[PDB]
Amino acid sequence: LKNQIRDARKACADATLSQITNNIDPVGRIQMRTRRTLRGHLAKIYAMHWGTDSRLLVSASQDGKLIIWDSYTTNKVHAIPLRSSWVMTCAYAPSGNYVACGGLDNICSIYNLKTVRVSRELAGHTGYLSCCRFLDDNQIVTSSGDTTCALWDIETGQQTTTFTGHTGDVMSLSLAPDTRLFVSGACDASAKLWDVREGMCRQTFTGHESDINAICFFPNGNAFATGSDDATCRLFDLRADQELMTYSHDNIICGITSVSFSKSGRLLLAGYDDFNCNVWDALKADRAGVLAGHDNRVSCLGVTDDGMAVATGSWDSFLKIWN
Amino acid sequence: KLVEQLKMEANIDRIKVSKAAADLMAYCEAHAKEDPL
Amino acid sequence: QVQLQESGGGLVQPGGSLRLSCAASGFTFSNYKMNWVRQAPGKGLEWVSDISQSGASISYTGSVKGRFTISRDNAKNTLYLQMNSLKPEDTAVYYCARCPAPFTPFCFDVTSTTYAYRGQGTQVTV
Amino acid sequence: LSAEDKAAVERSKMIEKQLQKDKQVYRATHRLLLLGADNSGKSTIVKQMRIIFETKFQVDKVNFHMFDVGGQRDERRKWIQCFNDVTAIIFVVDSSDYNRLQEALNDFKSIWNNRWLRTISVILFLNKQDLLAEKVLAYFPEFARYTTPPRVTRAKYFIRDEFLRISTASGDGRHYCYPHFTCAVDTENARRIFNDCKDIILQMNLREYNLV
Amino acid sequence: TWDGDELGYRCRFNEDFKYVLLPVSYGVVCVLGLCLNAVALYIFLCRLKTWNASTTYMFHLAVSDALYAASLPLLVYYYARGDHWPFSTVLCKLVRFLFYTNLYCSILFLTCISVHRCLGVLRPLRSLRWGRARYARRVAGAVWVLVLACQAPVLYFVTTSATCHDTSAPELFSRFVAYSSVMLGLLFAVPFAVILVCYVLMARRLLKAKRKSVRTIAVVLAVFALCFLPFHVTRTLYYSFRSLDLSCHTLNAINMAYKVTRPLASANSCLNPVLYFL
């Protein structure tokens, strides 16, 4: 009955965002100049996450060191060694006194730096951990490559629920501003909106062509954008249950590896694998100024909570605080 | 389980794309004065 | 949404020929390298053929080298696998699979036990 | 410029010192990726263990770190990207099973032509050679005519030649392949890995110095 | 040279033609060196993020070669507009001292690059074991301090006489010969032997892409030898190995060998940055 759902979504597709957005004041060429470039990582970077204080941020690299910066002054604050050299995630607590990581070895190590060694290790997954985002400083939603996310609990250390609905590997999840729902972009070219309390999928947005390496929520919480290996970012609306705008441009063959939204949700800052991140207009489907300052691949991206800066780590072992 | 989930999600309440588009327009026209990008 | 279905392989006597066609939908059919794949009764998932997005780069497995032909057509999203020498042990099942990434010949899980861009598979017997 | 700021800068400098020490001790260890099928004696190559299942062993006072990933599902298209700075890929192959050998060839072909592993040289171990000898003394249509450049020699060099053809089909100076004929009771595998890694680092240095 | 002039008065074979072609050769060396070294400096600093010992040495002697290129126009004017009428005695003092320190920096940094490259090609794993990196800056500062402190006698010896004498003076010529012989034997013979042993070692290990590497190796060693050995042998052969003898056909040979090898000693100065960044 998939054709029935396709027809139902077609029926409500009476208007197109590109056509509806035909008459709006365009955003001029965005000139984002590298304000800071944080160096000190032995090897390529894999993930990072801005803190709630809008300045402190964490970065995890291949070298096996989890490092906490201070983007305002660039003065490091912590360099926590890892129990495994392979990590592909980084989590920040809304309180700001907890940090998480993980990857191969299937452990979501969680550090308590409000004394910095370990506070818990979550060992329920049968595949590589991909992305973990702190929920309330006591529950940590966690993806994994065994095709199932999970909502954990620090005190018990065991899954509270399990979102076993996917078919491929889960790559990235983004919590809603309400902290009630979240999504997860899998490798089966889909992205399912889950429910934290109910613990069951509510929608599936099968509108991609290949894996989905990153995902982010709209600031209002009623839409989210996905980044694929088709070199195309798509914007999905929860209410309309269909794709709105596809940010695909010719002469771009490298697949996206990160995506994030601006404070007003106007610019989709998508970090590509073509040596240089891009900036897309959220509601115009047009390319704004490119942010090319990395000599290697871009492996992460994070826009500050207050929107004052956007950091784009890459595989050259350098974090750059653009603005 | 796949057909069960498809049946469960096929009866979801969906609205016109124009309504969501206008919601996004309102959001990014109201908050455009407080994003420093 | 990627969805691949194949037809035209249910049963054929050991002598003769058989034509397999795998239909492609939901994605651009000029950027992805398509491979064919088999199964066996109580065995693993084999690997047979391949053809690049450009049109002319065909790899093969040793067992069916020289008696199987593969062809793909753009502007009409479908795949083909001509088989003009049927042997009893090459007649278990014939899946249809796609390389995960476009503009890249690197395919790793085209024969994984639980793959996402694989067709439902057409039963083949001899 | 303040009370806490100078302490913060001191902490940053200390962290930088520890980072520099870790960099000094890190580039000296050559991480190795071990990739072999289930039947292949990839654990037997670890049966020579010398101090996911890491096995750290050093030869001539230089450390090698060996990583074999087996706790993950059989969809190694996204967790293999993590193994991009590995010095060499130790591809272990069971040379006895003719039926399963084609799968090993296809796996090696996928490893060789990969986009992200386009700069990783591969050490190829065709172990269980004793089983191969036993089988021949007691599939592939390319064996109809073939001359080695007893019959066990012809068979083993046929398998090696197939692997080498797969390697050189898209070969380039960026990365090379080093075949070997391992036995289940061989203890010199450490020396073979050492010589191969030495040549890999030598070629990396040659590329860096622009002598080529 | 008081005796060199004397003979040039007697042999009467001192062709101004070549004295007036020397400035154009010096100016060419200056302009090409300035261009190539400016390009290399810009690339290494404002267009590069990865640095290693080899790149450190390359940039870090290219800066010296750029300084020498910048100070060359003083000498091109000194030799071009008229013979021996400098702006000041101290100016030509500085020009000569800069030339010598640039030559010895080129030698020391090139042989350091060679030693590092040989350590990398002979025993790669163990060489990486003890961390050759992080010491390029230390070795570099050491050689800079060495040459700067050891070329002070060149500064004090040279003085004008009206003019800017290449040698020191009749009174101090014995000490000048001793100093020149010592500097030869120390900062050329030992570095030249080091680079020779180094590069022959890598040649033997490589011959055991290989053809291209051996070609590059022969080219580098040939450039170093051709652009340093002639000047260093000629200066000694001209200072004291020739004394009372006045064979002109040979004296002119020995002399103009010295004079035109000075630019040939500056050749690899401008030719090195490119050869080592390309």
Side-chain angles (χ1 to χ4, degrees), chain A residues 1 5 8-9 11-13 15-19 21 24 26-28 30 34 36-38 40-70 72-74 76-82 84-91 93-94 96-113 115-116 118-120 122-135 137 139-154 156-157 160-168 170-177 181-196 199 201-205 207-208 210 212-229 231-236 238-240 244 246-247 252 255-272 277-285 287-294 296-304 306-313 315-323, chain B residues 3 5-6 8 10 12 17-18 20-22 24-28 30-32 36-37, chain C residues 2 4 6 8-10 14-16 18-42 44-45 47-53 55-64 66-68 70-72 74-75 77-84 86 88 90 92-105 108-119 121-124 126, chain D residues 1-5 7-9 11-13 15 18-19 25-26 28-37 39-46 48 50 52-53 55 57-60 62-114 116-117 119-129 131-133 135-141 143-144 146-161 163-164 166-171 173 175-184 186-187 189-203 205-206 208-212, chain E residues 1-9 11-12 18-20 22-27 29-31 33 35-43 45-46 48 50-71 73-78 80-83 85-86 88-90 92-128 130-133 135-137 139-170 172-209 211-243 245-246 248 251 253-268 270-278:
Chain A
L1 57 91
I5 302 161
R9 286 163 167 177
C12 61
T16 304
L17 189 55
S18 82
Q19 301 184 30
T21 57
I24 322 182
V27 193
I30 297 286
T34 296
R36 297 294 181 192
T37 302
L38 313 98
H41 255 301
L42 281 50
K44 41 187 76 160
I45 315 292
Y46 285 133
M48 51 85 77
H49 203 244
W50 282 88
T52 308
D53 46 70
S54 323
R55 49 202 319 265
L56 297 170
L57 74 92
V58 74
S59 204
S61 178
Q62 167 165 22
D63 83 5
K65 305 209 81 69
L66 180 121
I67 205 185
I68 294 175
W69 300 100
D70 191 325
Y72 279 16
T73 78
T74 318
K76 314 178 162 47
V77 195
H78 287 105
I80 295 146
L82 276 157
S84 182
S85 312
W86 318 109
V87 307
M88 59 225 299
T89 171
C90 285
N97 47 357
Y98 266 75
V99 188
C101 59
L104 294 163
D105 89 344
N106 324 126
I107 300 282
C108 199
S109 92
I110 285 150
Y111 311 88
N112 167 14
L113 48 84
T115 73
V116 197
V118 157
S119 168
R120 204 58 48 122
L122 322 181
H125 297 269
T126 50
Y128 68 91
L129 200 169
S130 294
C131 204
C132 70
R133 301 264 155 281
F134 267 71
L135 205 68
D137 201 274
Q139 322 184 308
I140 169 169
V141 179
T142 311
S143 164
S144 178
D146 70 312
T147 76
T148 82
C149 323
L151 164 67
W152 288 91
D153 196 17
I154 286 327
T156 77
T160 286
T161 87
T162 281
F163 306 91
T164 185
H166 270 306
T167 311
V170 186
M171 311 286 207
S172 212
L173 61 94
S174 34
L175 276 36
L181 278 41
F182 73 92
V183 313
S184 65
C187 212
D188 70 293
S190 84
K192 300 188 154 42
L193 167 77
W194 313 90
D195 205 309
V196 158
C201 173
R202 314 211 324 167
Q203 278 173 249
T204 181
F205 307 85
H208 260 291
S210 167
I212 287 184
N213 317 43
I215 201 152
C216 187
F217 264 133
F218 205 80
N220 74 347
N222 280 348
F224 69 92
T226 72
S228 164
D229 280 9
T232 77
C233 320
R234 284 186 171 77
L235 181 85
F236 295 126
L238 303 195
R239 295 225 210 90
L244 297 197
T246 87
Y247 316 94
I252 308 176
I256 297 106
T257 81
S258 48
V259 162
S260 209
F261 260 108
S262 307
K263 191 252 197 201
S264 165
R266 188 65 140 98
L267 287 313
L268 213 78
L269 301 106
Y272 284 50
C277 155
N278 272 237
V279 173
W280 294 97
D281 203 343
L283 56 95
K284 275 257 171 263
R287 198 200 297 97
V290 179
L291 280 43
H294 282 283
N296 216 334
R297 197 178 90 133
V298 168
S299 65
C300 43
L301 207 146
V303 171
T304 315
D306 57 46
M308 287 271 175
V310 54
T312 311
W315 269 12
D316 52 34
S317 202
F318 300 132
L319 297 201
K320 298 189 131 76
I321 310 302
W322 307 69
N323 194 10
Chain B
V3 80
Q5 213 273 308
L6 281 180
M8 200 275 267
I12 207 71
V17 170
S18 42
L24 301 173
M25 291 215 178
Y27 193 87
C28 329
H31 280 50
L37 256 297
Chain C
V2 301
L4 310 112
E6 323 86 350
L18 184 67
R19 166 72 158 219
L20 275 167
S21 191
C22 156
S25 36
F27 58 88
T28 56
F29 195 56
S30 91
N31 306 352
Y32 304 87
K33 186 160 68 58
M34 301 296 258
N35 314 137
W36 282 90
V37 160
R38 330 191 308 192
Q39 188 130 14
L45 218 56
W47 180 93
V48 162
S49 170
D50 177 295
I51 168 159
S52 67
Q53 44 258 67
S57 159
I58 290 84
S59 319
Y60 257 82
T61 206
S63 53
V64 310
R67 73 189 212 258
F68 276 14
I70 169 155
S71 36
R72 92 192 270 167
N74 300 333
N77 284 12
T78 190
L79 207 64
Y80 301 111
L81 186 74
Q82 190 45 31
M83 333 211 312
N84 37 26
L86 296 323
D90 69 45
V93 166
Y94 276 62
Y95 279 90
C96 171
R98 176 178 58 80
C99 295
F103 331 112
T104 299
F108 275 65
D109 312 340
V110 84
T111 178
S112 166
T113 196
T114 181
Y115 197 38
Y117 313 132
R118 242 211 316 272
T122 171
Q123 166 56 261
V124 187
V126 153
Chain D
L1 280 86
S2 100
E4 296 95 330
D5 201 338
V9 175
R11 284 291 311 310
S12 160
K13 277 145 174 203
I15 291 307
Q18 293 177 335
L19 263 288
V25 85
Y26 158 81
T29 75
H30 299 81
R31 302 143 304 275
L32 280 160
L33 179 68
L34 169 52
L35 285 193
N39 63 327
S40 60
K42 97 190 213 163
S43 266
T44 302
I45 300 295
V46 183
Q48 45 84 15
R50 215 177 310 179
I52 203 182
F53 172 37
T55 48
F57 71 107
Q58 51 170 42
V59 179
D60 295 30
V62 50
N63 324 75
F64 297 91
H65 222 276
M66 192 98 97
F67 293 108
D68 77 310
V69 152
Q72 269 63 260
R73 303 151 67 263
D74 51 18
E75 248 171 285
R76 55 169 172 217
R77 85 174 95 78
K78 288 265 173 240
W79 69 259
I80 209 172
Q81 302 180 342
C82 264
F83 296 105
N84 215 238
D85 227 323
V86 178
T87 318
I89 288 164
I90 302 201
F91 195 70
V92 173
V93 171
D94 202 293
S95 203
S96 158
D97 304 44
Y98 304 157
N99 46 296
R100 293 286 314 275
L101 199 87
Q102 221 309 307
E103 202 284 334
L105 295 194
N106 294 325
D107 199 356
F108 184 48
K109 159 175 288 165
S110 157
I111 287 283
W112 194 243
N113 316 284
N114 176 280
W116 300 122
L117 319 179
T119 166
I120 306 284
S121 280
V122 68
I123 298 159
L124 178 80
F125 284 127
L126 317 172
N127 86 59
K128 324 203 176 300
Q129 277 296 344
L131 270 65
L132 182 32
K135 194 174 213 187
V136 185
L137 301 183
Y139 273 112
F140 280 110
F143 203 80
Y146 172 71
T147 319
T148 320
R151 294 71 70 201
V152 52
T153 316
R154 252 201 74 192
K156 62 196 284 201
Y157 273 80
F158 180 72
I159 292 156
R160 193 220 69 191
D161 268 0
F163 271 97
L164 263 281
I166 276 156
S167 148
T168 51
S170 169
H175 61 324
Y176 303 100
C177 172
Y178 309 134
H180 291 323
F181 302 102
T182 292
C183 155
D186 206 335
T187 189
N189 282 326
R191 175 58 44 188
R192 309 172 118 112
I193 286 160
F194 191 99
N195 285 355
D196 292 312
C197 216
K198 189 162 54 47
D199 185 282
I200 282 155
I201 299 295
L202 179 142
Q203 293 286 1
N205 287 343
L206 252 67
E208 161 169 352
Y209 298 150
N210 225 317
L211 294 176
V212 177
Chain E
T1 312
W2 60 92
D3 173 69
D5 303 359
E6 150 72 8
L7 58 90
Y9 221 61
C11 295
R12 287 304 190 91
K18 72 188 62 218
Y19 259 109
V20 308
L22 299 207
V24 55
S25 88
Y26 253 124
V29 165
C30 164
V31 66
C35 283
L36 280 35
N37 304 8
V39 168
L41 262 172
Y42 162 73
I43 286 148
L45 225 46
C46 279
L48 190 53
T50 36
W51 267 37
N52 42 24
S54 289
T55 310
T56 286
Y57 296 139
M58 294 149 170
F59 147 82
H60 176 47
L61 73 85
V63 64
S64 158
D65 218 308
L67 264 75
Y68 171 73
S71 295
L74 287 66
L75 201 293
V76 76
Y77 155 70
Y78 176 96
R81 174 60 190 86
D83 202 16
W85 287 135
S88 300
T89 176
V90 189
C92 90
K93 261 189 146 193
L94 217 66
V95 163
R96 290 266 135 76
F97 151 77
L98 259 67
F99 171 44
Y100 269 22
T101 187
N102 158 66
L103 217 76
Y104 294 156
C105 269
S106 270
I107 292 162
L108 289 199
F109 284 120
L110 206 155
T111 203
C112 282
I113 275 163
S114 285
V115 153
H116 170 259
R117 172 175 293 110
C118 304
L119 258 195
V121 169
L122 274 172
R123 45 205 315 112
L125 305 201
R126 289 122 302 166
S127 64
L128 260 159
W130 55 60
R132 287 176 342 234
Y135 283 73
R137 294 220 180 193
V139 152
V143 298
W144 261 135
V145 166
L146 162 62
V147 299
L148 256 291
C150 191
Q151 292 318 276
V154 169
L155 204 67
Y156 141 69
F157 270 38
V158 73
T159 313
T160 206
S161 150
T163 56
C164 181
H165 216 288
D166 40 311
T167 75
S168 60
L172 299 323
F173 197 65
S174 157
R175 256 87 161 288
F176 188 58
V177 160
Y179 171 84
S180 167
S181 176
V182 154
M183 270 317 79
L184 174 46
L186 292 198
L187 294 180
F188 183 58
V190 155
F192 187 42
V194 159
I195 183 174
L196 267 206
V197 157
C198 272
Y199 264 49
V200 74
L201 285 169
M202 308 171 5
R204 98 184 210 171
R205 186 145 300 195
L206 258 55
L207 226 47
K208 135 182 164 274
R211 298 121 289 271
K212 184 78 79 219
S213 193
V214 170
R215 169 193 146 196
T216 280
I217 275 286
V219 168
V220 171
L221 200 55
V223 152
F224 177 92
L226 156 54
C227 289
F228 283 150
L229 192 133
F231 161 62
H232 268 274
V233 73
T234 315
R235 74 180 298 207
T236 278
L237 154 72
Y238 158 87
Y239 287 171
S240 286
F241 257 117
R242 173 261 272 172
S243 301
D245 306 357
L246 262 294
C248 295
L251 295 174
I254 294 169
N255 184 15
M256 272 305 147
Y258 175 48
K259 281 311 195 298
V260 192
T261 189
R262 280 182 90 84
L264 212 71
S266 294
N268 63 2
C270 57
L271 183 138
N272 189 201
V274 63
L275 174 64
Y276 273 26
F277 258 24
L278 319 187

